[PDB]
Amino acid sequence: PIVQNLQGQMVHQAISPRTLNAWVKVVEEKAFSPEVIPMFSALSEGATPQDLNTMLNTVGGHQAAMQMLKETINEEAAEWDRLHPVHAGPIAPGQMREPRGSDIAGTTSTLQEQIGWMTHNPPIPVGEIYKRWIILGLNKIVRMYSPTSILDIRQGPKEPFRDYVDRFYKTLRAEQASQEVKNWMTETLLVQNANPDCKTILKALGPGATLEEMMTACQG
Amino acid sequence: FLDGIDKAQEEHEKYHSNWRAMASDFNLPPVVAKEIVASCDKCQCSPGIWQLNCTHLEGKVILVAVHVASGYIEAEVIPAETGQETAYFLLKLAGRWPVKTVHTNNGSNFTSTTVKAACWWAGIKQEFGIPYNPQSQGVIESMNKELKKIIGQVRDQAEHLKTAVQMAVFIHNFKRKGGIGGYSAGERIVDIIATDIQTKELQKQITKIQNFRVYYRDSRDPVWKGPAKLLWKGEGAVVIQDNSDIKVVPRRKAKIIR
Amino acid sequence: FLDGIDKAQEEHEKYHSNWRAMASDFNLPPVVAKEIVASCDKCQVDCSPGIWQLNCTHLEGKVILVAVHVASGYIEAEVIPAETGQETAYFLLKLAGRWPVKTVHTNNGSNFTSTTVKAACWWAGIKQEFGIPYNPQSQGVIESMNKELKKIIGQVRDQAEHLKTAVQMAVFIHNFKRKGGIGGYSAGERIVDIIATDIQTKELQKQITKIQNFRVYYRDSRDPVWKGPAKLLWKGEGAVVIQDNSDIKVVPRRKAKIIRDYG
Amino acid sequence: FLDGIDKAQEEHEKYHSNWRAMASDFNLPPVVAKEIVASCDKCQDCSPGIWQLNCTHLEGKVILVAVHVASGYIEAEVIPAETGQETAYFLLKLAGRWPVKTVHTNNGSNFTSTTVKAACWWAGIKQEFGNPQSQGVIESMNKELKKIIGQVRDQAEHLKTAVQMAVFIHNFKRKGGIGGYSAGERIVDIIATDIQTKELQKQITKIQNFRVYYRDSRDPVWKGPAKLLWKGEGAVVIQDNSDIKVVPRRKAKII
Amino acid sequence: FLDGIDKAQEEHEKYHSNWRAMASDFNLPPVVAKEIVASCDKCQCSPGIWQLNCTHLEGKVILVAVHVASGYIEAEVIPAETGQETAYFLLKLAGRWPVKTVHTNNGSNFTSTTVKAACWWAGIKQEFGISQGVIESMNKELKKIIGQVRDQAEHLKTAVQMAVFIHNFKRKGGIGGYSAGERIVDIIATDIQTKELQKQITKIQNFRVYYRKGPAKLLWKGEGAVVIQDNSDIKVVPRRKAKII
Amino acid sequence: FLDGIDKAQEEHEKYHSNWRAMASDFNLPPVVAKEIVASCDKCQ
Ligand SMILES: [Zn+2]
Ligand SMILES: [Zn+2]
Ligand SMILES: [Zn+2]
Ligand SMILES: [Zn+2]
Ligand SMILES: [Zn+2]
């Protein structure tokens, strides 16, 4: 990808096969789970839109999610084009106009255009915008691929609180909403949806207790 | 007991099998099998366990209980999904069959307070989740689907749903012959209960035995060893255990002290 | 005696069992069982197992149908809300599904001669005998069971919230923990033992026919060739008894092959 | 056969039991029971020929296992390297030990190779890639295999011997459900009953191809042609107008 | 006969089975089966008793086991002659079939430490010194089928496996026209059902019969004959001079 | 027997000859000719 040069001019770097192999194996292995969101951002640091498209097309199967992300990319590229004013005036040598909705996706733009945009001062964060677009697409894909809600989790009378809290936080991370609502639900549903003995224990502990205190008290 | 203790010890050292398996294979009381199992450093009641399942048919809920050792079936349709009716069925089956542990699966109606009170009154331990037996998981569902197959077949010749379901379960219990053995489920369950009664008679016979410290002598050695815990006395010999070793000695080479 | 007194008094305030049951089950001296029975304010025929007797009674304004086993005294009672032949047929098919009954003794009541009852008894192949029973012993057992069930229901009605629950608790305590006056064993144990010891002739005959259906190939001590399809009688660890043209022969297991020629 | 056919017909219209029960409880030939079942409108298995193959990883090595759909019988082996030759060898061995007609398996690389395709085409084995409820049974058997090989590894020096000992104990001395028997008794009973049923149906197929004409006590004229069902004891049992009758051989002719 | 000639030819070009095999499998008369066989240019005790032996073929050692009672065959080519692989094969065949006794010679491999340890661990009785005619006939028959299928044999192991498969399944045997697999299945099933029924009795039937001596137990009464067992000895007596209580 | 069934049936579909003629002309056993005749719907 775009790699900074030691007190020199940055040049294009070939993509290591290790990153592609690791990405495809981790994608095919477990699921479209939230843990793939950080992993992807670790495997695409400072990458051109062409590199992002190449990484995207390497996946095998599950083409429905590919269609979802392509449609979202198209709509958000249209939004970016409609919000960003169209550049006007002559284009001087060594500079390029603002990338189009198709250019940020990398479907039509070539590597030379990306290099020219990167070397332009100030640099255009086209790659970062496309990466965050892909992040949003993956977030909504994970939202679709969650076969459970947050309000339907129940704890068995003899079920330990450990896996109950584990699944509660798994569903909390699988659910996307504002942070305040997440705090409210993780403060209320945890006590409100437990076994009666630990429920009364938590009520005795009072509101605002740290989760370490409740997990130590519910033991037994 | 004709040198079967050594064979059981060798079999548990090479396999570490269930105590009841050794007891049945070598015709031994369960106590010696349990002590042999406990002797194993890496190791530490099938009748009376029932499994309950719920199904939907003709827009109505039907609850079916099935035994694990024999597979005896009971079924009933409930007008409305409430815990009171399930508790009533549980107490009726407790009052009709000897039930020791009721195993079920996850369910909102199974965790009701009424069924908990009903099972606490009867003294029956209830639980839900993975079946206790590591095998025969598919037996319950195969029997349920056989019942579902036969109820649709016998529905056309009946006037009511409940009568048809009960006739189908009666046919499955009595008028359906199996494979190995080839007899009714009632016959196998009554045989199991009879063998349970016989094993309880053996248990009370062992209860007749008590501390009864016994000293032993081996191979006519001049020394007397002991004390050793008495296990069984009969056929002119006495089988005892000591230091995780079980052995049988003739009576002429042993003494019993009150 | 190893904390058995407390558990015994708990199960007696919950069950009100007989003192023989307390002595046998919890391993306690008879004096403790007798004093536990006294402390409670609520306490003070060999034939074919196919014979059962069904009767109906009016208790507390409700109709109760009770079926009793003649050979053991086992009882099963239910509370029928509305007296109809349909519910009687329901109870009959329930008891037929749960037990291999073959003969039922009933009176000349309207619901006993219902079309549903006739259809059920014809379908299940159960003999029906209306009228007064010919055995006074069965009537005496009926009366004793009736008075005992009335007493236990009166004792246990305070604990239960409904009549059906009280009846079921009464039948549970009678069948499992209560010990009868003959032998001192529970009714359920007696009936299950009778059922276990009853199914012997049919299985014996079917096993005899099956063992006679087998085919055996055997050789003599000095004969290297095999013989014909000798019928099988008995199999042993090291010897087999077979028939070969009305001749009884005992052959060692080494020189005997047992086969069922499917073709 | 002493007027037990009418009783069997009545008890089959009542209970609708299996043909084996009808034959056993009244000493009837299998042909009579089969035709009674067929005549019933209510009434209308190749189980041993169905197997499932699964591969797992342990200690960095591949272990393959084939499991019967019914009775929970298993057979496992370790493999040095995962290619088509070892899979073909295992398939050929299992075909040489047991009769298999079809197999279900996943979409692995070794399953899609040409070697296994040729091996199964040689033996006429249907290969299906992809199972109503057998998944739970096979996964429970696999977990039992894992726990027993973990427990038995203490006294073993090589993984192959440990796997063989584990499958031996599982298939011989691990009593399961109804009857308290092992997988061997179940498999042998199933295959024996299947062989018996197939030979009985082949005998019926080769017997029924003959027509009959009989004389009765009220009409010297031969009537028919009825379907041949059974012959013996100087008589023939046949069926005409969906009614089963018996006629002495001296008053009957077969074509 | 319904298009059975074509499939009979297509299976004879595949396995080259015996005439009785395809005669019984496809329901064809024996005459046409014999004609099909001729038209091919390449063609013209106790359940626990098992016999294991070693054979040499083109610089290869092969361990071959055979069930004496049913004639079932198994074989495996051992690359380097050592007792460890013999023990491995023995434990594998034990895991695949119940064996209580093995008849071998005094060979070093058969008496090897690993083999002895495995057989003692499995509880299998050992008998040295050996019946042999049947083993030799099966050996030469399998050599004949190996020669028959060697034309399509890419490797020795596959050829041996296919020969075992065609011998055990694709060829009918003797009495009843049953293959080795059918015979072993039948004998195992009969043994299982007979032992089950034997364990069923002596739990219900327990009678004492006096003849001529002692309180013998009744074993079988009928057809004017009483067979009884006492002191581990079986005696048959006429219906007279025998009282059943 | 050497492909005689096919020629026998193809000529029987045109002429419907007696089983003896098929047996003699094509050298087939009488049972094959009889069952070939039986397979013909027109003949009996
Ligand atoms: Zn152990
Ligand atoms: Zn009391
Ligand atoms: Zn039917
Ligand atoms: Zn050939
Ligand atoms: Zn014609």
- A145's tokens: 């691929």
SS3 content of chain F, % helix, strand, coil (to 5): 70, 0, 30
Structure letter (DSSP) for residue C175:
I
What six digits make up the tokens of B253? 């080479």
Which region, left, alpha or beta, applies to residue E183 given φ > 0 means left and ψ of -120 to 50 means alpha? alpha
Size of interface B-C (CB pairs under 8 A): 66
B111, B116, B120, B126, best to mutate vs chain A, most A CBs in 10 Å: B111
**Residues C1, C29 contacting (CB under 8 angstroms):** yes
What is the chain C residue with the closest CA to B92? Answer: C168
For chain B, which residues lie within 8 Å of any Cβ of chain A, measuring from their own Cβ? 106, 111, 127-128
What are B116's two structure tokens?
């908990």
Contact B12, B37 (CB under 8 A): yes
Nearest CA in chain A to B112: A157
CATH assignment of A1-147?
A: 1.10.375.10
Q: Please say whether the beta carbons of D64 and D146 come within 8 A.
A: no
Could you tell me which of D49, D74, D191, D190 has the C-alpha nearest to residue D124?
Answer: D49
DSSP 8-state secondary structure symbol assigned to residue B66:
E
Q: How many CB atoms lie within 10 A of CB E179?
A: 21
In this structure, the number of other CB atoms found within 10 A of the CB of residue D181 comes to: 16
Could you please report the per-residue DSSP string of E103-145? EE-S-TTTT-HHHHHHHHHTT-EEEE---HHHHHHHHHHHHHH
Which of B72, B163, B173, B207 is the best mutation test for C, with the most CBs of C within 10 A?
B163
Contact assessment for residue D159 and residue D59, using Cβ atoms and an 8 Å cutoff: yes
Pairwise CB contact (< 8 Å): C123 & D14: yes
Helix-then-strand count for chain C, H and E: 9, 10
Tell me: is residue F16 an annotated ligand-binding position: yes
How many Å lie between the alpha carbon of E183 and the closest alpha carbon of chain B? 20
Residue F43 labeled ligand binder: yes
Report DSSP state, residue E150.
G
Query: β-pairing, B49-57 with B101-104?
Result: parallel
CA distances from B205 to B200, B236, C28, D10, D99 (A): 8, 18, 16, 51, 51
| B38 CB-side CA count, 13 A | 11
Q: What is the largest CA-CA distance in chain A?
A: 75
Helix (H) or strand (E) holding E182: helix E180-200
Check if A196 contacts B (Cβ < 8 Å): no
DSSP for residue A98: P
Secondary element (H or E) of residue B56: strand B49-57
How many whole angstroms from E36 Cα to the centroid of ligand 4? Answer: 8
Q: Which residues of C touch B167 (CB under 8 A)?
A: 93, 97, 123
H or E stretch at E221:
strand E216-222
Helix axes E113-121, E83-96, angle to 10 degrees: 20
Q: How many CB atoms lie within 10 A of CB E222?
A: 13
Residue D98 DSSP code? S
* D200 touching C (Cβ < 8 Å): yes
Q: Residue E210: what residue type? A: Y
Instruction: Give, rounded to a whole angstrom, the gap between the first and last alpha carbons of chain A.
Output: 54
How far the first Cα of chain D sits from its last, in Å, is 24
Ligand closest to B21 (CA) is: 1
Contact F23, F29 (CB under 8 A): yes
Q: Which helix (H) or strand (E) holds A99?
A: none
Q: From the candidates A155, A158, A167, which should be mutated to test the interface with B, based on the most B CB atoms within 10 A?
A: A158
Nearest beta carbon to residue D195 from set E169, E185, E192:
E185
CB-CB under 8 Å, B175 with D17: yes
Do A156 and B111 lie within an 8 Å CB cutoff? yes
Architecture of domain A148-220: Orthogonal Bundle (1.10)
Amino acid identity of E211?
A: Y
Element (DSSP H or E) covering residue A174: helix A161-174
User: How many CB atoms sit inside 10 A of residue E194's CB?
Assistant: 19
Report the distance separating Cα E67 and Cα E62, nearest Å: 17
Both tokens assigned to E48:
């626990």
Helix, strand, coil percentages (3-state) for chain E, rounded to 5, are 45, 25, 35
Is E191 near chain C, with CB under 8 Å? yes
CA distances from E224 to A139, C248, C255, E216, E242 (A): 89, 11, 26, 18, 11
| Encoded tokens for B48 | 């009376």
User: In chain C, helix, strand, coil percent, each to 5?
Assistant: 45, 20, 35
Are the C-beta atoms of residues D172 and D182 closer than 8 Å to each other? yes
Distance CA E49, CA E67 (A): 6
Kindly report the number of other CB atoms within 10 A of residue B145's CB atom: 13
d(CA C170, CA A99): 87
Q: Are C196 and C49 in contact (CB under 8 A)?
A: no
Of D96, D164, D185, the CB nearest to E165: D96
Rounded CA-CA distance B66/B75 in Å is 9
Q: Ligand 2 centroid to A178 CA: how many Å?
A: 64
Exposure string over A58-76, b if 16+ CB within 10 A, otherwise e: eeeeeeebeeebeebbeeb
Q: Is F29 annotated as a binding residue?
A: no
Residue count of chain D, please give it: 255
Q: Spell out the alpha helix ranges (H) of chain C.
A: 4-14, 19-26, 30-39, 85-98, 115-124, 136-156, 163-172, 187-198, 201-212
CA D227 to ligand 5 centroid distance, Å: 25
If DSSP states are collapsed to H, E and C, what string results for B93-159?
HHHHCCCCEEEECCCCHHHCHHHHHHHHHHCCEEEECCCCCCCCHHHHHHHHHHHHHHHHHHHCCCC
Tokens of A168: 């509660």
| Residue that is written with structure tokens 């040729």 in the block | D118
Answer whether D73's CB lies under 8 Å from D184's CB. yes
User: Within 13 Å of residue C211, how many CA atoms lie on the same side as its CB?
Assistant: 23
Pairing relation of β-strands C62-69 and B254-256?
Answer: unpaired
Nearest-CA neighbor of E36 among C99, F3, C69? F3
d(CA C34, CA C41): 13
Give the separation between CA C226 and CA C220, rounded to whole angstroms.
8
| CA distance linking residue C84 with residue A203, whole number of Å | 54
Are the CB atoms for E227 and E220 separated by under 8 Å? yes
Place of tokens 């640091």: A45
Chains in contact with D, counting 3 or more C-beta pairs less than 8 Å apart as contact:
B, C, E
- Interface E–F counts its CB contacts (< 8 A) at 7
For A214, D10, E45, E51, E139, the CA distances from E128, given in Å and listed in that order, are: 72, 61, 17, 10, 20
C-alpha torsion angle, residues D150, D152, D153, D154 (rounded to 10) = 120
What is the β-pairing status of strands D211-214 and D252-254?
Answer: antiparallel
C262 touches chain D (CB under 8 A): yes
Chains B and D touch (3+ CB pairs under 8 A): yes
Residue A196: both structure tokens together: 């009666």
The string of DSSP letters for D34-86 reads: HHHHHH-SS-----TTEEEEEEEEETTEEEEEEEESSTT-EEEEEESS-SHHH
Q: Which tokens in the block code for residue C75?
A: 């009882």
Give me the half-sphere count of Cα atoms (radius 13 Å) on the Cβ side of residue D143.
Answer: 8
Cβ proximity of A106 and A49 under 8 Å: yes
Dist. CA E107–CA C95, nearest whole Å: 68
Dihedral sign from CA coordinates of D103, D108, D110, D113: positive
Contacts of residue B90, Cβ cutoff 8 Å, sequence gap at least 6: B102, B115, B118, B119, B122
Q: Cα separation of C170 and C163, whole Å?
A: 10
DSSP E151: G
Long-range contacts of A15-21 (CB under 8 A, 24+ apart): A15/A51, A15/A54, A19/A43, A20/A55, A20/A58
- Measure the CA–CA gap between E87 and E111, rounded to whole angstroms: 10
Q: Distance between CA atoms of B217 and B223, rounded to whole angstroms?
A: 7
Residue C69's nearest CA partner among C98, C111, C107 is C98
Dihedrals phi, psi of E5, to nearest 5 degrees: -65, -45
Residue extents of the structural domains in chain A: 1-147, 148-220
Strands B254-256 and B214-216: antiparallel
CA dihedral sign, ordered A159, A161, A167, A172: positive
Q: How many angstroms separate the CA atoms of E66 and B82, rounded?
A: 63
- Asked if C170 and C153 touch (Cβ cutoff 8 Å), the reply is yes
E120 Cβ under 8 Å from any chain B Cβ: no
Torsion of CA C212, C214, C220, C223, to 10 degrees: 140
Phi first, then psi, for residue A146 (nearest 5°) are -105, 105
Strand, coil or helix: what is B51? strand
User: Most B CBs within 10 Å: which of D155, D164, D178, as the mutation test of the B interface?
Assistant: D178
For residue F31, give the chain E residue with the closest CA.
E29
Residue of chain F nearest E29, judged by CA positions: F31
Query: Is residue C107 within 8 Å of residue C130, measured between CB atoms?
Result: yes
d(CA D71, CA D179): 12
**F12 known member of a binding site:** yes
Mention every residue, 6+ apart, whose C-beta is less than 8 A from residue B200. Answer: none
Closest CA to E90 of E53, E140, E47, E136: E53
- Give the orientation angle of helix E132-149 with respect to helix E156-168, to 10 degrees: 120
Residues of chain B with C-beta less than 8 angstroms from the C-beta of A158: 127
Count how many Cα atoms sit within 13 Å of the Cα of residue B26 in the half-sphere of its side chain.
Answer: 22
Give the residues across from E220 on adjacent strands.
E227
